[model samples]
Target: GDQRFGDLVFRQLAPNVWQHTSYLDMPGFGAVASNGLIVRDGGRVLVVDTAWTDDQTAQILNWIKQEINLPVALAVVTHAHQDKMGGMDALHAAGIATYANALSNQLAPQEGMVAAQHSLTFAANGWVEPATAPNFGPLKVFYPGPGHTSDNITVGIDGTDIAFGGCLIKDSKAKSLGNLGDADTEHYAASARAFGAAFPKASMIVMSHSAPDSRAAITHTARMADKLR
Candidate 1:
């Protein structure tokens, strides 16, 4: 049952994944909605990113315990952005394990967000598919360069065409770069292209601030990245 209040609404996107939506009412910046993921596989529940605030993150944890009746085993912080890791306090309090890229952890404190307890390292040559990956179950995590942030990573659910692109990807309706203060515009186009190349069959690309999109949105992002260069 999707809630109308919109603080924390979960909609199952795939067999083992649910899209968690939450909102942050920024006085001057309008309502900043965030999209995260909830995965239940192999008898463990994993959270991909988090809600906008600590309270909303607690709400998600509460709902999971009461409705899903499953304990959350882990969480993956997508980036250092507030929308991604601002809820670390709640997750830490729940004693749930968490993971994030090394650079994300380094940059998170600057944004006034708590870094993940553990750091997920990637290969420098290319994306590595660890045989024994983190306890995220069937989800394969990839680093397709960097677009939204240097630490941005793509999490693709194995055996499915869905990927959580986070803020690195733009929706079909997006025309301008949302926030480039921390973006490496010089290589953002390459990063955008790499996302499509890495997930050639992607049909649903979920972003932090937008609804699910397709690979075409990745192309759009590349175009915008170059045009603005």
Candidate 2:
């Protein structure tokens, strides 16, 4: 069952994964939207990223309880961007556990943003920096280096191999790398390539602002990254 409230839309992406989209009118971007994921855990749900504002985030929470019939257990702040972590306050007020990379925590404060409740730091070698493997029941977390932002990360569904690319990977319709205000353009391609190699089994890729697609979006992102260099 799907539902729409205000500018928010909740659509089932998979068995236990739901996609939450919120539309917003930006000055330069005109009408833009942000995408996130909601995965059902044992008896609770985990939210990946969030809407761009507290009110928008609240709508999602309300629907999750009333319609989805589950309480939010965890929320991941994929990066420091407003479209990613702007709902931290609402999540905190709801007493929901929220986590993010340490770099995201550090950068958010610098940008006058609120950081997630929990912060994680992973080790890096090549472009694929292995994470601490935060246990969220059936979810796998991966930090494939810096691309969209210095702290961007991806989430994988354990059994299904569905990956939430956040802002690291672009959508099929994306012509160029979306935003780069805090991105590492010089290393974007390398980091993205590392991601492709690391998650070879990822069959489905979900981005922060677009529809879900296959792993081909990685190639698309890599190509766009080369264009930026």
Candidate 3:
């Protein structure tokens, strides 16, 4: 029951897909939360994002190595936000390969963060098949339009009906979109629509800020974003 290391908590979302949550101490906002995925594929591991800081992320990596007894083969940062890529330094230090699409790399520098080691090939506002490029196996990387950030991407684990919505999809209780600093507000609803379409079979969606939910969460995001009009 206790799958925690430091401030990070790991909850098993599927058989081998884990949803890990961490917090960020915002000066005025108190403790802000975020979630990522730890997918154990065979003898290798794939981390979708990092913890709030490198220290926490490093601990996560250590937990995987010591507990899971497997090496992290790949890490995919879903966006440029600190909640997504804040542990870049730790990941590189572990000698684990990192990847994000081209857009994420371009905007990462603006946030004073290092870009991913390599770029995942995919057309803008399109989906990439798991085998199209180097993957952790059975994962589909899809970039719907753009809501939370212009470079935000969602991941769907093939055959599992599980999708990691990152910040693109909001929690059911969220009245409105959370972060708009780098968001495409006018097109967020469209993005959510596209995101929903991209993963029609996603029965379990791992929200970055909330507990795992279903496709209804995506609809909730779209509905909330529509109010921006």
Candidate 4:
């Protein structure tokens, strides 16, 4: 009948693609209620990360299915954190192509999933390792090089003025720059700086959380993140 604990808020960011923001009402996380997104890139659909639990994942999936029957062509994990990644099994079960940055591809299954199992009330459902082979619909997998995590990658969408920044950069007003607790700070700063320098034209930045943002948002994030140094 009804869905789970979260509410699905949709924003049509492109012609066919939509951003489904997950607003979860749950315990143990939220930390400000983590958000995830779903995008329709041409014929394929992409879901970037998911909520922290099965129930929350169900809410997002139901919302997507209700809105569009487009098969999930990919599931992109923003990083190796449990909150951003724990719902992989659910996504995979629905027949979605799944991927993670090479770093997350390595880190999540190793120690992260294990630790998650210990903490959650539910047993961890080990997801088949998401591939590291980067592919997007004619766009490039620009390795911003080690920010947030060494394997962190952002997808530049073709024909669309958007950059799917997977946790490396958050939307403006994000009080915390996701610390590179998994990588080097100096390297992370350099990565962020390099991405900024290279993409002087990225008008819209779509963070793993929050709504789509502007290039000015990137500038703000850069300033805040650099301050951590």
In order of appearance, the predictions have TM-scores of 0.93, 0.92, 0.94, 0.75
Number of the top-ranking candidate, with TM-score as the measure: 3
Return the candidate ranking by lDDT, descending. Answer: 3, 1, 2, 4
Candidate 2 to truth, TM: 0.92
Q: Candidate 2 — what's its lDDT?
A: 0.81
Q: Order of candidates by TM-score, top first?
A: 3, 1, 2, 4
- What C-alpha lDDT values do all the predictions have? 0.82, 0.81, 0.84, 0.61
Clash total of candidate 3: 0
Clashes found in each candidate (C-alpha, N, C closer than 3 A): 0, 0, 0, 1
Q: Which 10 consecutive residues of model 4 have the lowest summed lDDT?
A: 114-123
Model 3 score (lDDT): 0.84
- 10 residues in a row with least lDDT, candidate 1: 125-134
- What candidate 1 gets wrong by more than 4 Å, as runs, is 128-133
lDDT of 4 by residue, 1-229 (tens): 1233345456777676556555544466544445555677656677766766656676777777777766666666666776577777777667666666545666776745411111111112211222333344534456666667666666565567766676777777777775456765666666666666645566878776666777766776677767767
Identify the superior model by TM-score, candidate 2 or candidate 4: 2
Q: List the residue pairs that clash in candidate 4.
A: 30-33
How large is the C-alpha RMSD of every model relative to the true structure?
1.9, 2.3, 1.6, 7.6
Better of 1 and 2 by lDDT: 1
